[PDB]
Write a protein that binds this DNA or RNA. Structure first.
Lengths: 146, 91, 37, 54, 122, 141
RNA sequence: AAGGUAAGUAUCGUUCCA
RNA sequence: ACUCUGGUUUCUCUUCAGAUCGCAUAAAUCUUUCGCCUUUUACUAAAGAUUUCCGUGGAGAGGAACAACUCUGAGUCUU
């Protein structure tokens, strides 16, 4: 096989061996589950739901979170679209550009939200008959490989 | 006392009300709404872990949602018979 | 598909801590020669 | 007073979540500094006797 | 060229940019000798095949050495079932080769809804 | 650190900014127990007498005075703010932040350099002065 | 993601808030 | 072939975890060693030592569901 997959084999084996060597026994714990405490709390409810509905729900929830983080200091010249792209509503004056900047953590959260939104929208495309099941699988593989 | 599953349409009447901060139902009770948002990335895991499967048209899952629609966790772990899983991916 | 989920379990507490610091009522944010003097 | 109760509930939930290894990690660090306090003592008790002699 | 390479190897022994594609300089399969440059692929008794690769592609690609070995050892009394099973396979995957056919030689009546979507996609 | 005068409540620091007209008020916001704050609260010791003519130094513990954390962004461990005639004198460093020195330095000449530059630019009537040294790096090599 | 804010003086609009 | 025998499933709480907790495998912090080296934030890629994270096993306790259909060892194992 060509070089660009031979080197792929060595680079897969390198990470596999690194994980095998750097493995450590798990540390003793006390088994405090997280969602179980949520169920104990009065602020949460359980319900059987379709997964695609859950994705469309979580996309709106994360979009609202990020819009709140944007409108945390009341700076209206930064706008988040529904694809999790942060764009200026008007060309940024330098004072406002520096005044509206977010650390790497916010950008990482926005981008992982974009990833999950992409996956959820691909599944919606599958459910709406816009794409085939084969097309859905190929698109999911492209998302997770690019 | 025990925890029971609310009707699936109840969470839908919250999301529509909770589309934006404009809605007047939640203007002063913010200490309970945004507090849960710190757990949002965790939720992003629980659905990508339980993401519907290629041979699965509808993937019904248990959902743990906040009383104000702020968050919706997939309260499940996709346990699968691993020989069955490998055979299915072989097909 | 699984790789990004292990990445997710890796980064979950980092974001769950940064957001908690950010979205809260109260916010919080060459040293040896300065040590023993 | 509902806001304070909600904040206390969430803080208690988070504090419950750190009990996975809290009792073990704090004990480990307690034992770990005491091994460091042998080779590298504290300055104040390094001057304990002279302070007493003052 | 193997001699010069192996002598050179003996002398060796005894004396910002977000790039995603790897480099070709991390390749390690480079060998100066034939016995490791060209390793004898495991024929696995001819009845075992690599996982990812397709089955019949391997079968036709196989060295056929065990095929002729079986041809040598097999007696006539137990060749009838071999021929019968082989022809029955050829027929049953011919079912797939003919029933599941590209639209380029499928008539309209033969063409199905899945084939209709195949044609429209094309 | 402990030698320099300390301010205990919110009124005192505002008065110290207001109770002076002919010098510069250099306030070290932070925690005097911090390794960072103690690194420069001795530099501010070593030059307090030298800059008596055109500078007065007060120390403030943000925990003791939790009144300026939100308005002046007191979340870095150590902060230095210069005030002139009840006016915050912005100073342009090599760093992105141009309102404070949020790191503790080491040389007793450079801090007098910065204080004297602030005084010189404040007598003219500016609001932003320019530091002599550039702090876009650390000149380490 | 940054290390890229010139500091100001004016009337005008808005809004919360006392 | 007579007996007594007597539940599994499910949801939690509390601890202990030896073991591939896990036939899987992430991230962070710190200390060294390189690489880079222009400052943070990212890194570099190995080592060591930590922590959180996604999971797990066991034991016990408390409910709920099959709590009452059973069932198991024991026995004198009765033509």
């Amino acid at each position: 096989q060509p070089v660009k997959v031979r080197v792929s084999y060595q680079k897969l084996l390198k990470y596999y061996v690194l994980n095998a060597l750097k493995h450590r026994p798990p540390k003793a714990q006390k088994k405090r589950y997280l969602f179980r405490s949520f169920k104990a709390t009065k602020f949460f409810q359980s319900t059987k739901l379709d997964w695609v509905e859950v994705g469309l729900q979580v996309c709106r929830q994360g979009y609202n979170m990020l819009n709140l983080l944007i409108h945390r200091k009341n700076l209206n010249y930064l706008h988040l679209d529904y694809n999790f792209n942060l764009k200026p509503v008007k060309t940024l004056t330098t004072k406002e550009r520096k005044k509206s900047r977010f650390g790497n953590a916010f950008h990482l959260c926005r981008e992982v939200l974009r990833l999950t939104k992409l996956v959820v929208d691909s599944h919606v495309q599958y459910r709406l008959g816009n794409v085939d099941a084969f097309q859905l699988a190929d698109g999911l593989q492209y998302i997770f490989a690019h | 006392a025990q925890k029971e599953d609310m009707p699936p349409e109840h969470v839908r009447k919250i999301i529509r009300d909770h589309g934006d901060m404009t809605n007047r139902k939640f203007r002063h009770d913010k200490r309970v709404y945004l507090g849960a948002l710190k757990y949002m990335p965790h939720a992003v895991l629980k659905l990508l872990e339980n993401m519907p499967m290629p041979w699965e048209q509808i993937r019904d899952v248990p959902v743990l949602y906040h009383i104000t629609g702020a968050i919706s966790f997939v309260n499940e772990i996709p346990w699968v018979i691993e020989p069955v899983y490998i055979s299915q991916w072989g097909s | 598909w699984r790789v990004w989920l292990f990445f997710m379990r890796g980064i979950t507490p980092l974001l769950e801590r940064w957001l908690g610091n950010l979205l809260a009522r109260q916010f919080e944010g060459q040293r040896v020669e300065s040590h023993f003097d | 007073k509902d806001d304070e109760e909600a904040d206390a509930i969430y803080a208690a939930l988070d504090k419950r979540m750190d009990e996975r290894r809290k009792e073990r990690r704090e004990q480990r660090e307690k034992e770990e500094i005491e091994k460091y306090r042998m080779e590298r003592p504290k300055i104040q008790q390094q001057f304990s006797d002279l302070k007493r002699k003052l | 060229k193997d001699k010069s390479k192996e002598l050179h190897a003996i002398k060796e022994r005894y004396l910002r940019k977000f790039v995603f594609e790897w480099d070709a300089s991390e390749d390690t399969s480079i060998d100066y000798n034939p016995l490791y440059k060209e390793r004898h692929q495991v024929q696995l008794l001819g009845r075992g095949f690599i996982a990812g690769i397709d089955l019949k592609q391997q079968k036709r690609e196989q060295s056929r050495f065990y095929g002729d070995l079986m041809e040598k050892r097999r007696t006539l009394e137990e060749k009838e079932q071999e021929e019968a099973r082989l022809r029955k396979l050829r027929k049953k995957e011919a079912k797939q080769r003919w029933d599941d056919r590209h639209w380029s030689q499928k008539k309209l009546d033969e063409m199905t809804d899945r084939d209709w979507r195949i044609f429209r996609e094309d | 650190s402990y030698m320099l005068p300390h301010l205990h409540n919110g009124w005192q620091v505002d008065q110290a900014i207001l109770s002076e007209e002919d010098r510069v008020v250099v306030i070290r916001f932070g925690h005097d127990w911090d390794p960072t704050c103690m690194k420069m609260d001795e530099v501010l010791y070593s030059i307090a007498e030298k800059v008596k003519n055109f500078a007065v130094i007060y120390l403030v513990d943000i925990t003791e005075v939790p009144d300026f954390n939100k308005m002046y962004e007191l979340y870095d461990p150590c902060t230095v703010m210069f005030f002139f005639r009840n006016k915050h004198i912005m100073i342009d460093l090599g760093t992105g932040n141009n309102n404070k020195i949020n790191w503790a330095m080491e040389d007793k000449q450079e801090m007098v350099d910065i204080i004297e530059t602030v005084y010189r630019g404040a007598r003219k009537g500016r609001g932003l002065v320019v530091s002599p040294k550039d702090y876009s790096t650390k000149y380490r090599y």
